[PDB]
Design a protein around this ligand. Sequence first.
Ligand SMILES: Nc1ncnc2c1ncn2[C@@H]1O[C@H](COP(=O)(O)OP(=O)(O)O)[C@@H](O)[C@H]1O
Ligand SMILES: Nc1ncnc2c1ncn2[C@@H]1O[C@H](COP(=O)(O)OP(=O)(O)O)[C@@H](O)[C@H]1O
Ligand SMILES: Nc1ncnc2c1ncn2[C@@H]1O[C@H](COP(=O)(O)OP(=O)(O)O)[C@@H](O)[C@H]1O
Ligand SMILES: [Mg+2]
Ligand SMILES: [Mg+2]
Ligand SMILES: [Mg+2]
Ligand SMILES: [Mg+2]
Ligand SMILES: [Mg+2]
Ligand SMILES: [Mg+2]
Ligand SMILES: [Mg+2]
Ligand SMILES: [Mg+2]
Lengths: 299, 299, 299, 173, 173
Amino acid sequence: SEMTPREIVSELDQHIIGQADAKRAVAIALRNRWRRMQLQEPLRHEVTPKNILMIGPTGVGKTEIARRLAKLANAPFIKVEATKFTEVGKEVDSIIRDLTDSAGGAIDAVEQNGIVFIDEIDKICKDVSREGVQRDLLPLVEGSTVSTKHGMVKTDHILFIASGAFQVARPSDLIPELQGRLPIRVELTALSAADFERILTEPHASLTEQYKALMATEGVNIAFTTDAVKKIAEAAFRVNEKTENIGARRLHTVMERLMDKISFSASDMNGQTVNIDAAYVADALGEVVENEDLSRFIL
Amino acid sequence: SEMTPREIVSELDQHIIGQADAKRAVAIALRNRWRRMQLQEPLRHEVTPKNILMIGPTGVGKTEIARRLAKLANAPFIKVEATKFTEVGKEVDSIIRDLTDSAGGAIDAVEQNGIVFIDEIDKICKDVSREGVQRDLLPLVEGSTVSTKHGMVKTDHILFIASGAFQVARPSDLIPELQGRLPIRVELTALSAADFERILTEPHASLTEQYKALMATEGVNIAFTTDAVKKIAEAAFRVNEKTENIGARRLHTVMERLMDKISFSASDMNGQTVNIDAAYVADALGEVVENEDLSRFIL
Amino acid sequence: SEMTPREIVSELDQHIIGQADAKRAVAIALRNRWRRMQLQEPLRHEVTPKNILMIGPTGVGKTEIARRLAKLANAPFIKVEATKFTEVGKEVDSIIRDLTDSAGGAIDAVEQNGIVFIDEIDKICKDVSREGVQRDLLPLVEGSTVSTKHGMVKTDHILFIASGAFQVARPSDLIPELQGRLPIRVELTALSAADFERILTEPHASLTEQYKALMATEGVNIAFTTDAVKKIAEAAFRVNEKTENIGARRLHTVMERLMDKISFSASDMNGQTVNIDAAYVADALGEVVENEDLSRFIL
Amino acid sequence: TTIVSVRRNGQVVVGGDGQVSLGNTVMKGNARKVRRLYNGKVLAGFAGGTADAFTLFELFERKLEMHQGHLLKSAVELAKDWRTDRALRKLEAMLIVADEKESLIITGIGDVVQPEEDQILAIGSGGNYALSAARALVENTELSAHEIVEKSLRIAGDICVFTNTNFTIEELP
Amino acid sequence: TTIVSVRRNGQVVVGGDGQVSLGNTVMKGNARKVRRLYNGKVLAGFAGGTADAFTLFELFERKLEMHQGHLLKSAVELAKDWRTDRALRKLEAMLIVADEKESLIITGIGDVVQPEEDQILAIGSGGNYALSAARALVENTELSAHEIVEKSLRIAGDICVFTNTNFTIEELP
Ligand SMILES: Nc1ncnc2c1ncn2[C@@H]1O[C@H](COP(=O)(O)OP(=O)(O)O)[C@@H](O)[C@H]1O
Ligand SMILES: Nc1ncnc2c1ncn2[C@@H]1O[C@H](COP(=O)(O)OP(=O)(O)O)[C@@H](O)[C@H]1O
Ligand SMILES: Nc1ncnc2c1ncn2[C@@H]1O[C@H](COP(=O)(O)OP(=O)(O)O)[C@@H](O)[C@H]1O
Ligand SMILES: [Mg+2]
Ligand SMILES: [Mg+2]
Ligand SMILES: [Mg+2]
Ligand SMILES: [Mg+2]
Ligand SMILES: [Mg+2]
Ligand SMILES: [Mg+2]
Ligand SMILES: [Mg+2]
Ligand SMILES: [Mg+2]
């Protein structure tokens, strides 16, 4: 009636490179929805989700997994920034009223198997406000009934995944009632050059897969060369390290900073084919920009 | 027409381990609803609930009792964090408008025998805000009429149970009008290793009872061994002591940190049976994590 | 067409022990509603209520009188904490919109003879906020028209009773426009041991009268002995003095701290009769609790 | 200023001089430095700066009214206000308060302190002087409490240039 | 004031004098400077200004109640409050706290410090004196812990004019 914790992983294994623990974590959590529910009279209602706490940096996939598992689960998904609430109920029961909105209005579905993603939760810790939303979320997590224009919806069986880098804060800093409701804690890892290469081609509709399919509209045929991919990747990883590490979104940069030229003039090239090799890549990505002299502040 | 203060206790005695005073307290309070009401013309309305103040730590059951008594009483239940109000009436008469919502809209029921749980009340004491909600709650407790989309509902006979650890604050710090309306004060006790063991198997749908029934879905048969249970428990109690004591929710951790492996691969084991003994448990729960060096702050 | 200032008092004289001045004050005020109204064309509208300011401590009855006079007057009653407003009109014209709600919606009644009780008014004195509600209340008191979902209702003939302990503040601290609209000022007195005894049995549905009638439901017959009552009372008065004086609500404590045992096991005693004498009482009320060492702060 | 109090045989006496000294000159010789509180059932005597002494006294007065006059409690409460988190004005003065129950001095920095055993307390610039006197007397003379105080103040005034002879001795039946 | 603590053979002793000195005079000779916390399972002794010492103590007390009494932790937490960003009152005092686990002194400026190895700690004006004494004794005498402390304080009092002889030695079975 649905995949197995092995099968689900493989389903994410496509769209997402690396992050095994995370892929696995949510893999179990989603099977259970199916395990319970198969159960009898009292136990179907007694067992509650084993919500997750993802801990990893930017653009390493902490959200894709969540968003993808939901998609392969045809389940009411919604994301919210923990800080949205730093400052008819209040503005927080909304996370359900909203979910039910996107969900269509079918409660028999929202409750039974909807998923909620609380981004940046590591961000509302340790100041009298941030440490309030923890409390504001408890009902949400610990089991609560909330009013919405479609009817009453309870968070008793909603699945909660929360992310964070927790560079400064540890999850041990969350309020104890919560640490207790984020049982399962996985750890996604940062991404590497060798990883990028992989994201660059492997997944479904990879960046290259996309630009390729697009140019194919103007009547153009582009072909990415391993050696090129390798460079695009080395590139991304570089700047992320050297400047502001934005995770894997960085590929979306190096990618567009490279395809600029073809992307423009591609209309007037119908019939041709283009080969993106190293020598090309190497020439679309300058080398290093701006004097970047951080010395003007030093003595 | 309902159980007796002896019978009710036994009903909680199932789902909840320990906490006699608390189980008892609410046991009386619920019989009275039945005693009064049996009374005559003027006295049925004259006698008011003898609301409770539960004092105990995290996950020791201060809420289960409340939630369970309500369930065995088929009564309109609602929980609210005292602090929710730290900062059409105002946001507080809502505790009734909301209760009536969940209650369905049947006032003849909300008023007559609904129950309200005010969590963390020990938390709005001693700063000009926290000491306002006490006042905000008085009407609620001391007898008040409040407007809701279903009609007028009065808190004259609603039962109020309020919790707290009161580690820093004593209940003697509440405003006098309230100390007077939280007559009955019980004291739940913290939980012990020997207790966990008990919660671990004894109650209805105990953790073990659950994982067992779940794996039984994949076509697996697991069996918990006393000696294992004993360890799971010693485990929980340990970390709660050694790190952040989260009460009994901690079992939900050690439990999931142990059942990880089987929970995943259990799909591909139909037919087999699994025995969780000590040697197993002992090997799913590392020993102690992170250098946890708190010295980097000391001289 | 209604009692006389002598008859009304006697009506309160039942449910309330002591507080003659207060009982009397409101006794006059309620007769007048009847005196005026009997008057002619212009004078029926010209004469206004002579609102009261009650000054006394906790649980001495400043509210019962108000609530009871209203009940014997079948008049739209409402209570509000002066501080509720420390921080469609604004939140204060509400005291009328609300009263009209509880009143049903019959304005011909709300205006003509409704009563309003402003608790803790001694509490919004001498800080730029508390001294605003005085001003906010003026319209209310001095004669104002206010919009409500049922129609226009004017406070020209509403009766206003306001309470206070005024331990720190005197009523002379209210804003002059108000001191002028709280003409009549009575002074309820604190309650004594000898008083408790009286409240304990004398009124209609006295505590003892209640527990007695309740146990009578389980098929039990309890009998309070003078000597016991005397002790219960000495008890209350004690702790109120020795710890936090909460007025007479304290009886509701000593009372429940005593009836605990019987209240529980009373179900399994059908047929028996119970005698609560001194030796009993003396043994349900320990003696003094907690080391109560307030020395840990002294040098 | 000198403010001393002695307690013996159901008697509690708290009395002091009456000199207000501005710099090295005299503002007024007659001044009531000991007064009555809570309907007149608890004795008080303030020392230090006229301004800060009075503002200390008043604050102790609010507490009483708020705690059924229960002295000791009232004190620790007030003291607490300085120990909270937001350092209050920190009045530079001292108060000696007592009633039928106990004696107690309170600094405006945040503490409540109790007498040795001789139930002798004395603040002010002349205190210790009056102290010594009383600390003596008491140990060697069945002199009344309302008597020791009277003589001790005087002994002081004849020593402290900021302590005069116009006393005020409030006792507590 | 002198507050010293010695720890040896499962025994932890923290004791100190009892003198409250106002300027160069004596407020009260009997004063409990060492007290019990957390249901009476952790020892405490404060030094410095009566006001700020007490307000330091109390703050350490809240932490314990909030951290299953786990001493060390509780300390670093409190310390943190001074290291955050908004410089707190900065109490001028010092506390010596210990229990079955460890000993530790905490300044009111924001730090927690640990004993050398001789498990000897001593704050106050007489500290170093009592220290030396104990630092000695310990190295040359199988004297108990509840014994070294007793003698070390005394050695101090006979040296520090602000440290008297009315001790209070709270040990921990
Ligand atoms: N490990 C990965 N594998 C494949 N794609 C990834 C990976 N990490 C990030 N991405 C891509 O980068 C973008 C950012 O994804 P996101 O989940 O928001 O990172 P994060 O969870 O840290 O905020 C997405 O479009 C996603 O496909
Ligand atoms: N004494 C107990 N007996 C059985 N289960 C308990 C007990 N204490 C806590 N639990 C379990 O731990 C979880 C937390 O319950 P909770 O009532 O919220 O603790 P608290 O009232 O202190 O906040 C619940 O699922 C409950 O079943
Ligand atoms: N003088 C009294 N006589 C009879 N009952 C009293 C008296 N004073 C207080 N009570 C009882 O104590 C409870 C508190 O009444 P309340 O009017 O709110 O005191 P207050 O006006 O000071 O706030 C009520 O249930 C009331 O019946
Ligand atoms: Mg992100
Ligand atoms: Mg809780
Ligand atoms: Mg909590
Ligand atoms: Mg009142
Ligand atoms: Mg009050
Ligand atoms: Mg004016
Ligand atoms: Mg002189
Ligand atoms: Mg000395």
